[PDB]
Amino acid sequence: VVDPFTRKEWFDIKAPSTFENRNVGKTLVNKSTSASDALKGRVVEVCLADLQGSEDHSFRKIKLRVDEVQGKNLLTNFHGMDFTTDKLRSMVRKWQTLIEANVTVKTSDDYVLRIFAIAFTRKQANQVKRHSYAQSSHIRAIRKVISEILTKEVQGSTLAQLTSKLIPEVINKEIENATKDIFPLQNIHVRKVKLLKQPKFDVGALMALHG
Amino acid sequence: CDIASTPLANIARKGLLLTYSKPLTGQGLKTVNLSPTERYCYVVPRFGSDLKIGWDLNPIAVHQKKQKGQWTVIKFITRKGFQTITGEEKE
């Protein structure tokens, strides 16, 4: 007897200032009898290309959680990162070794998180061998180097600074430079970022993040 | 008049009657690969154009080139020439 959308109201999401495009669309909710409780805890996943306006990030998705509401503006925060499934299936190929590392670490803001990085061996310019498998010792050494680099980068930074590092893929450059001598590599990427635990909420840190 | 199998294939080669099967395999018949785009191999020519009656002709040694990714027959080869080619690759 009631069309639900008569009682619904529209709200506009906004993104972190770390991203170039703050506008990421809109959502809707039942009107307060409150709406804020339904809004809080909501997560929206969006490709980095939309937020940064470049197709170079088309294979990367960011999950942002709604943390505050003000005047039909939904103020969100970074919640997670992942790649597109198609990109991952593209990277994995026959005749090469897949090296994967995972690290659990907390930021300077007490944001406990988990980083998954992936990389693949590559054949050199003058290679004539079909494949480029790496000995287990090289795999272990590379994994240690990657874990140390990830831990150093995360611990010595804040979450906003962490995302500021993820967007330009500086960490991948540092990893490949460090692991260069051990074994040549390709497709070095921070595959995934999970947010395990959250500190006590601080609306001030969110407003300052959003300007 | 009568026509032998191998001459018939040569005459039909420049026409649209002749189609080539995939390279044969086995003792004696082996694909000698000069290069990524060159090979020498035996094929079974098919004469005729599944609604008409075509048939396969005697196997013939052919020179095949990969032009535009498809294997195209450049020349026919005698048995002696093919045998010499196989030895020339082995040495």
Binding site: A125, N126, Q127, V128, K129, R130 | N33, S35, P36
Partner: peptide, 17 residues
């Protein structure tokens, strides 16, 4: 020279073949 790269390619084709 860059002709060296061509030699790598054809050898690669041989090996995989």
């Amino acid at each position: 020279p860059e002709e060296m790269r061509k030699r790598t390619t054809e050898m690669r084709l041989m090996r995989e073949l």
